[PDB]
Amino acid sequence: LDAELDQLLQGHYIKGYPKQYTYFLEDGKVKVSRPEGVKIIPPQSDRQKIVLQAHNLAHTGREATLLKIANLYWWPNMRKDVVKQLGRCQQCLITNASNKASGPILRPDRPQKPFDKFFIDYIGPLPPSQGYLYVLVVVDGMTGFTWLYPTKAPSTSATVKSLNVLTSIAIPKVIHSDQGAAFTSSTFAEWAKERGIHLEFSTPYHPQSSGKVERKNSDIKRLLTKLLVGRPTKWYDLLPVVQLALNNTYSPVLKYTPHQLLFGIDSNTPFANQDTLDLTREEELSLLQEIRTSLYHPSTPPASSRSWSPVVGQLVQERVARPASLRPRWHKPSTVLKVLNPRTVVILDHLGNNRTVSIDNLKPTSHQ
Template sequence: MTNDDSPSNLNEDTKTIEKTMQPVLTIQAQHISTPNESLMIMREGCNTKKKLIYLPSSLINDLLQVYHSDPLSGHFGVQRTYLKIKNKYWWPNMKQSITQYIQSCLPCQQYNISRSKKPGRLQPIPPPEGPFQLIGMDYCGPFKQTPRGNQYVLCLTDYFTRWVVAAAVPDCSAQTTAEALFNEYICKYGVPAVILSDQGTHFHNQLMEAMSKLVGYNHIYSTTYHPQSNGMIERFNATFVPQIAKLQDKENNNWDEFLLPVVFAYNTGTHSTTNYSPFQLLFGREPRLPTDGQIYSFTFRKPNDYYEQLKKSMKLIHGYARGNIIRKQHQYKTQYDKRRPDPHYAINDRVLIRRHGIKNKLEPKFSITPQIIIRAQHPVYVVRDEITQIETQVHINDIRPIYVSKLN
């Protein structure tokens, strides 16, 4: 016998079990001691008849506490709980009562992972009218440090042409971010109207705020833990990492030497959304590649003719590209929204929010304490913790309503 199995501990465990089972024992005792058959109900099926205890409404919660929340019941779902109860007890709308009770079980709401689609419809970002009006910015990494000291890649993607700029950098500090943005993008392509990024400290800081005011662009931030808000650059990151991994010399760890060739290959390939290459949408022509043969030249009567022809071509392909973007967004939204719930919450609604970065698998997946909706701009909400009063901005994807039992 171990210390944990001492008589005192066993007695405590026995008392706990007896206390938990008391409601059931009370119900069964009432049934045995009461000769009145009105407490019984007869169920027929499979050529058999069975007497069931008719449970009064005042005892339903006590019984469900034992059959669902007790350690020996395991917090299982509606069907398993119902099958355990139905052969012993009966009351009107029994399945509905069990469903409501389990839906309102707070531990189940905090720990259970829904197998249905996450709530919230897709909100596509309207395509800009032209290049460099809206760009997305994000970091990829860390990777293994190269001999040049690089560990991260700062990626910037134009939302109209899909033109990508990528810079290998040693870290993702605010100073490094500002320098790379200025040197690799602004000095080469001009100042974008809007930059979209996540709320990481490398983007959301005093230095970047000062730079946006000084240079003259609007910096907006996506919702925390909602990469779909900046989905285009997330998809590029998922594309270029495998390509670099295939090309790098693992012994010399020179992935940063292949970064620009991979970006060039991406920019000169036809994009599935626009049906044009980013290079063509930016420069009005296709690039000459090492595999190309004879160079074709065009003769214009006046030097200005080339400019006029280029302007017409750019206007034409930009119009086609924008139409293709809108069409693809509509197709993707239709597919994404199919059979997807889209609940709306009001001010003062009590909810739970998803907890990200949980490494311990036994930790609850949703907030331990309820959150109160204090600002609503669907699909983004601001919630306040009931205990700590901390305010958090959260997307509808990460919100779960709190169900409260309607049982007496």
């Protein structure tokens, strides 16, 4: 306040105020003749108020706030005071966008065996077809082999029915799904515990985590659309056709079809491969075990030049799931409890709960 500015007027050096400038009094205010013009030096005790008034005009960031202040004032290290206020404006913290990208995606290992891990998801609502509106899609992680079930709703009950049919063939170690209501119910949890199946859930609002099945959903819809061109959208009867067609389609990068990865030999479908015609089944199965272990696996791509990776203790904010009109897109800051992997974290959330959350649904809180 006055002490600092008093010593200044009588020409004694205060750290932060360059000595080469002439500090005077005028109209009751301490002033300074600076290259850009004459500015007022407010007392220290006034500065927070000033920064806040300037910031609050339009809730501006660092430079746009500074530029307002600099019109009338000069003092040492103004930006440090601006940033301090930026870091405390609740309204800015929860409304502004991030300008840091998430760190590069993980490419988790392909499950080692068929039936190690299923990925399941719903597609729909679709145009009504025989009273059906949805498809349960079940994709085996190792093979890509896919099962399709028409349903009337994306319910637990229709999931259970379909999976009772599917698991007639084999029981998977793990079923991975997103947090759809169908999959997160206690009825579905019981259904799986009864069978020794572990349920694994995606972080919330992050369909990339179910990417294996989401990507198959694309192929399913794309083929259905093609087969329905210029006809009414009677898709129900094409599910079996699409299922078989996709299960026998080559992945160009793998040089195998999902059917081949599951069975190691084509069934009686068109253009069946015949290379192992002279092998015994055991020789065939032995080649299959080899084929399975040496499939192409992609690697984590380069980070973008301005990504961030989460650190224990960091303040971060979770994206608001379905933000109302004219409401913030971000929750209040919360703390990273645990870094599960570089793309997944436990945070101590906006209430008081632990939440496991994708980094794609977080921003690091700005201004420390």
